[PDB]
Amino acid sequence: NPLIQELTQEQLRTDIPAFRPGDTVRVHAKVVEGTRERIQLFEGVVIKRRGAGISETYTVRKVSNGVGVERTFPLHTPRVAQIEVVRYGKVRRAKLYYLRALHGKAARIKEIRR
Amino acid sequence: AVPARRTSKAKKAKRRTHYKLTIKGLNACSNCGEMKKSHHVCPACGHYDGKDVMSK
């Protein structure tokens, strides 16, 4: 463990804001359309986070044009530029897998100040 | 499946050559001399490792 952490230490990002599963987030991804570079945005609710080290990932749920979409990211990629927390949610567990079988108003998460 | 031929005396006894008993590590007690199993309490006097153990 400590030989691996030392090698991988110099590649962890330091500008990562704190968030939990349940919060809403805007990810500033990076797309390459031929030679062009460009930035998209992907707005949704964080539903997963499974971790320990450079190997940390999270996933975001969204509903686009009547179909639900999920996108998982590593925490430390340089191919993301920004993670912004928009709201805070009141939640009671770590994996919000029950959201993937609800729609509209049943899938509502209450807000909370922090 | 059933034995097609009976087995003779030589082949029975050649099977039975790895069918014995062993009497492994036996030492002498340090306190009372008599033989005892190593890493065990001595059954004759209740001493293990120079002290008394099966007493109060």
């Binding site: 030989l3 691996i4 030392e6 090698l7 991988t8 590649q11 080290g53 450079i54 190997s55 590593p74 430390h76 990629t77 340089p78 191919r79 | -």
Partner: protein, 207 residues
């Protein structure tokens, strides 16, 4: 040519310059020492005997100390021979360190696979099952043993038995990074063996 002995630490991840994610395997190799040089006049062929991983001294005996004495090292745990390397260029006492390789350097990697015990023909050989319903009594068995005419079973009829524990080499892997002050090589992909097991790394045969 180039070749070193080391031990297996584990697997991790890494991002590249362009920003791709790549799985990797850390191998640790403290300096190897050349203990003996084999030639055609003495031995009949050409090779080099290398040692790795220092050993406490209650754990060796007198013949081993005598063999390691002409090279001025501590007794070693792992001793291998490295062939097809222009001798010259080498002498008893020398140290081979990880900066023998650089990033790039397509390489071969060998080890001994993990042990798994007594296993059946389905896990051991990739054989398929029989049906699980429809009156069946033939789930997890090795098949028919052959035809009637030769009055016997042929060889290489495959069955149950002890699985794993053999040596395996994997060809054409890449060195992603070399770190000298720590004696570490990063190799792209997965390697055979368990953790703390001996690993050998040579430059590749197919070039």
């Amino acid at each position: 040519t180039k070749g070193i002995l080391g031990k297996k630490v584990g697997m991790t991840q890494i991002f590249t310059e362009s920003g791709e994610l790549i799985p990797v395997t850390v191998v640790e190799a403290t300096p190897n020492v050349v203990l003996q040089v084999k030639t055609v006049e003495t031995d009949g062929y050409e090779a080099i005997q290398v040692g790795y991983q220092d050993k406490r001294e209650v754990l060796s005996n007198k013949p081993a100390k005598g063999h390691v004495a002409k090279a001025n090292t501590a007794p070693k745990r792992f001793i291998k021979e490295f062939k097809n390397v222009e001798l010259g260029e080498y002498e008893v006492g020398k140290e081979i360190k990880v900066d023998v390789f650089q990033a790039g350097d397509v390489v071969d990697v060998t080890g001994t696979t993990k042990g798994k015990g007594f296993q059946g023909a389905i896990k051991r050989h990739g054989q398929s099952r029989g049906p699980m319903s429809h009156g069946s009594r033939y789930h997890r068995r090795p098949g028919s043993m052959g035809p009637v005419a030769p009055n016997r079973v042929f060889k290489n009829k495959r069955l149950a038995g002890r699985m794993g524990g053999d040596r395996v080499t994997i060809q054409n892997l890449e060195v992603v990074k070399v770190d000298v002050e720590r004696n570490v090589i990063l190799i792209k992909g997965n390697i055979p063996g368990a953790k703390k097991s001996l690993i050998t790394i040579k430059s590749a045969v197919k070039a």
